Design a protein around this ligand. Structure first.
Ligand SMILES: OC[C@H]1O[C@H](O[C@H]2[C@H](O)[C@@H](O)[C@@H](O)O[C@@H]2CO)[C@H](O)[C@@H](O)[C@@H]1O
Length: 470
């Protein structure tokens, strides 16, 4: 106590935020340490639960609903005055069960970035790209390259024809109705898989690779957010930020993220944190510092938002955001992201059919929660697997092959597997960055007693853990 530790992703303007801390230390004498750990969104909950963790954590609003439910977040109490300074849309994003849990910072959205010396006219539709690629392939270039390793980037396409995360009905989200295995999704994803089959794109393409490609002018287009602009400005590439291409006449639907800053419920400096955020970061001078390092896009503060609205890049950001859908901040979000992530990855690698991959993503997102530990794996399965109300039995569930002998625990609503990674991995591989331990969870009620007909209750989902190669 007597300082502030802050966590924020590595792709954000952490250097600018540390400057806002440099000022905060000068005026109050309290030192601010800004950190940018990898997987900090998965790590925060882990440390915060043990009383530890940073004072302030930065991330899109979608994670904070889970945090608040786990009791890891202190409630924020800004007065009516301070509230008027921020847009009502941004406050809604950080509200869970009728409470304010974090401070809205900026509004993010994925935009289409093109290099106009290469491509004066950006494609208005996705379909135009397969052909536009052949033309560029002719002169040692590629049409499009972006991060295929994160569902955040490929979702805008999948969600175009009618893909959605959770059905919002009657004023609430139905965590059992997930729209990832419908025709709209399959369409979007199928198109993406085709691109990789057509070799118009590489399945192993991730953030840095797509960044370096576009920044070195090796590709005409890329998809990314405001934070990316800083590095593209330094590469002195004549680029442009425009609306995302439409898929089958329908516009791409990106998830709208609202960069938020929460306060650790176990943080001893709650008052100090409230000061820094309200009275140092959320001001014209504070947001300016960060924005300069890495663009925040459309800031939540009305005063500094209007000053940046002139920027055509921000305008295109807002346009895509307008055509997109705000992320739910419900705790089931993480399950959703994992489900989709695994889906896209398996499909793109041709390891699964689009129809199968999105089928498993359906179950995963609804019924399954995977937790990856150092040498250990935890899989939690909803007993109401199908949503029929008929609870499955533990003996019917099976993790991995015969060698996998996990410790099985059974609650009223769940069945939990604790498995050793070494014992339970059916498949291991290496990516640019990652070691991937993979396995499957299986529900096989058979042999059954009655005549199994219509819908089959044999379900198999992918269980995967990805670890950074250091
Ligand atoms: O891809 C899954 C991922 O999506 C979002 O993460 C974004 C984040 O919102 C952006 O600020 C920036 O950091 O890019 C991220 C994707 O690499 C969700 O916020 C996150 O929960 C989810 O895991």
């Amino acid at each position: 106590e007597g300082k502030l530790v802050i966590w924020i992703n590595g792709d954000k303007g952490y250097n600018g935020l540390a400057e806002v801390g440099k000022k905060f230390e000068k005026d109050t004498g309290i030192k601010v340490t800004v950190e940018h750990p990898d997987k900090l969104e998965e790590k925060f909950p882990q440390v915060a639960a043990t009383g530890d963790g940073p004072d302030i954590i930065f991330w899109a609003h979608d994670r904070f609903g889970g945090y608040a439910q786990s009791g890891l977040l202190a409630e924020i109490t800004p007065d009516k005055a301070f509230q008027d300074k921020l847009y009502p849309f941004t406050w809604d994003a950080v509200r869970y069960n009728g409470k304010l849990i974090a401070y809205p910072i900026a509004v993010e959205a994925l935009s289409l970035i093109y290099n106009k010396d290469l491509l004066p006219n950006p494609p208005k539709t996705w379909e135009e790209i397969p052909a536009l690629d052949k033309e560029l392939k002719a002169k040692g270039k590629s049409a499009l390259m972006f991060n295929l390793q994160e569902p955040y980037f490929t979702w805008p396409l999948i969600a175009a024809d009618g893909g959605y995360a959770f059905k919002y009905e009657n004023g609430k989200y139905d965590i059992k109705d997930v729209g990832v295995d419908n025709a709209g999704a399959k369409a979007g994803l199928t198109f993406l898989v085709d691109l990789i089959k057509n070799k118009h794109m590489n399945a192993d393409t991730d953030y840095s690779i797509a960044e370096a490609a576009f920044n070195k002018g090796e590709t005409a287009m890329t998809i990314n957010g405001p934070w990316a602009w800083s590095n593209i400005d330094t590469s002195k590439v004549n680029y442009g930020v425009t609306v995302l291409p439409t898929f089958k006449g329908q516009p791409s639907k990106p998830f709208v993220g609202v960069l938020s800053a929460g306060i650790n419920a176990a943080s001893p400096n709650k008052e100090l944190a409230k000061e820094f955020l309200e009275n140092y970061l959320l001001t014209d001078e504070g947001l300016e510092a960060v924005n300069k390092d890495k663009p925040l896009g459309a800031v939540a503060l009305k005063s500094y938002e209007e000053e940046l609205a002139k920027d055509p890049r921000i305008a295109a950001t807002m346009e895509n955001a307008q055509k997109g859908e705000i992320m739910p901040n419900i705790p089931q979000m993480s399950a959703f992201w994992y489900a989709v992530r695994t889906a896209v990855i398996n499909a793109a690698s041709g390891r699964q059919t689009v129809d199968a991959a999105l089928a498993a993503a359906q179950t995963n997102a609804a019924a399954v929660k995977v937790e990856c530990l150092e040498a250990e794996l935890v899989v939690t399965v909803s007993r109401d697997l199908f949503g029929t109300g008929k609870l499955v039995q533990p003996g019917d569930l099976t993790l991995g092959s015969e060698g996998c002998q996990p410790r099985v625990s059974v609650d009223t609503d769940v069945v939990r597997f604790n498995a050793q990674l070494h014992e339970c991995s059916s498949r291991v591989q290496m990516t640019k960055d990652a070691l991937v331990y993979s396995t499957f969870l299986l529900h096989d009620p058979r042999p059954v007693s009655g005549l199994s007909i219509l819908r089959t209750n044999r379900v198999e989902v992918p269980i995967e853990c990805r670890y950074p190669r250091l």
